[PDB]
Design a protein around this ligand. Sequence first.
Ligand SMILES: CCCCCCCCCCCCCCCC(=O)OC[C@H](COP(=O)(O)OCCN)OC(=O)CCCCCCCCCCCCCCC
Ligand code: NA
Length: 166
Amino acid sequence: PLSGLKKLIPEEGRELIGSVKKIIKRVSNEEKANEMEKNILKILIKVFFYIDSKAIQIGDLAKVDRALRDGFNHLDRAFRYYGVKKAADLVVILEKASTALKEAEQETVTLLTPFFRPHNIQLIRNTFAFLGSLDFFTKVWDDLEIEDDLFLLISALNKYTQIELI
Ligand SMILES: CCCCCCCCCCCCCCCC(=O)OC[C@H](COP(=O)(O)OCCN)OC(=O)CCCCCCCCCCCCCCC
Ligand code: NA
C-alpha cells in the first residue's frame, strides 16, 4: 500500500504533502494529485536514504532548502492578499515564488542527477514544473472554495521555514 511510504517521512512532510494533495485535487484532478504525491514521496525517500547512507551531505541541500524557503515566503506574502485581489494583480509575488521554486528545481536536479536514472530526473522536472507553475498559483488564487485548504498549505509551509536545516 501507501502507508509504508508516508511512515519514512517526518510529520511535517506528511502535513505538507497532504495539504498539497488536497490543493492539486481541488484545482487539477485526482490522478494528478495522487501522481504528484507519489512523486514527492519517492523523491523524499530516495533523498533521505542518500543522506542516511552518507552518499551526500546534509549541506548539499543548502541551495534547495534556501530556494524552497524563499518560495514559501513569497507564497505567504501572496497568501496575505488572498480574497482581496486576483491572481493577475498578484503576479509579482507569485512569479517571485515561481522563480524561487525553479531555482529549487534546478538545484535538486543538479544534486540528484549522479544518482537517479533519467526517468526519476524527468519526474523531478515534472513535479517541480507542475507544483511551481505560475499558472498553478493563478488557478489556486482565483478559485473561491480554497481559502480553507490553502490556509492549511500556507500554515504547513510556514512551519517548514521554522525548521532551519543545518
Ligand atoms: C514544488 C516543490 C516540489 C518538491 C518535490 C521534490 C521533493 C523535494 C526534494 C528536496 C528535499 C528538500 C530538502 C530536504 C531536507 C529535509 O527534508 O529536512 C527538512 C525536514 C526535516 O526532516 P528530519 O528532521 O526528519 O530530517 C533531517 C535530517 N537531515 O524534512 C521535511 O520536512 C521534508 C519536506 C519536503 C518539502 C516539501 C516539498 C513539496 C513542496 C510543495 C509545496 C510547494 C508548492 C505549493 C503550491 C501552492
Ligand atoms: Na477550501
